[PDB]
Amino acid sequence: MVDAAQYFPGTWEFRFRSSDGKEYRGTVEMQPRTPTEIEIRFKGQSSDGRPVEGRGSIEVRSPYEYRFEMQSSDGARWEGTLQVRSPDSVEVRFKSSDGREYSGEFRRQEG
């Protein structure tokens, strides 16, 4: 597995989409708080154009996989896991407080 504080810090673009077609896109900045807790700050917007922002984290908790959580200024609360696929690409799968199931991707940017 990747080393959390080696791998995740940086700027990423994201796209998340639910099975019903709701979609969020935006940019995140990740930085370590500790080696087991990577903080996320993000700005983005839903597919209806509504701007959102918020915070989240990637954490070491379970023995099996990274924990992923994000909370949005429009009230969306997201909790799930992720799978690193390459040096610049991470897939995510999560449940939302609105009852939706999402999949999505982070794509690493320069700066």
Side-chain angles (χ1 to χ4, degrees), residues 6-28 30 32 34-40 42 44-49 51-68 70-92 94-100 102-106:
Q6 178 179 22
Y7 176 87
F8 288 108
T11 302
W12 305 72
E13 290 190 349
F14 74 92
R15 184 264 278 272
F16 305 154
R17 187 181 177 98
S18 74
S19 57
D20 60 276
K22 190 168 171 98
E23 181 171 295
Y24 287 83
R25 286 177 183 268
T27 307
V28 316
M30 302 196 197
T34 72
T36 56
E37 190 175 3
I38 314 307
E39 296 307 319
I40 296 165
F42 75 96
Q45 55 285 328
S46 57
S47 49
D48 59 3
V52 299
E53 58 184 340
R55 300 195 166 196
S57 67
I58 294 164
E59 296 176 346
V60 183
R61 290 293 183 274
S62 93
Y64 306 137
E65 70 195 343
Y66 280 103
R67 175 182 175 275
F68 166 76
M70 284 177 55
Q71 299 191 132
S72 178
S73 62
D74 73 347
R77 299 191 309 264
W78 298 328
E79 310 182 62
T81 187
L82 55 86
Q83 179 59 68
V84 178
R85 307 295 312 185
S86 75
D88 67 1
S89 171
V90 181
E91 293 186 357
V92 303
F94 59 89
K95 305 281 203 299
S96 181
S97 48
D98 46 40
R100 296 178 159 111
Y102 289 77
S103 57
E105 192 191 4
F106 293 109

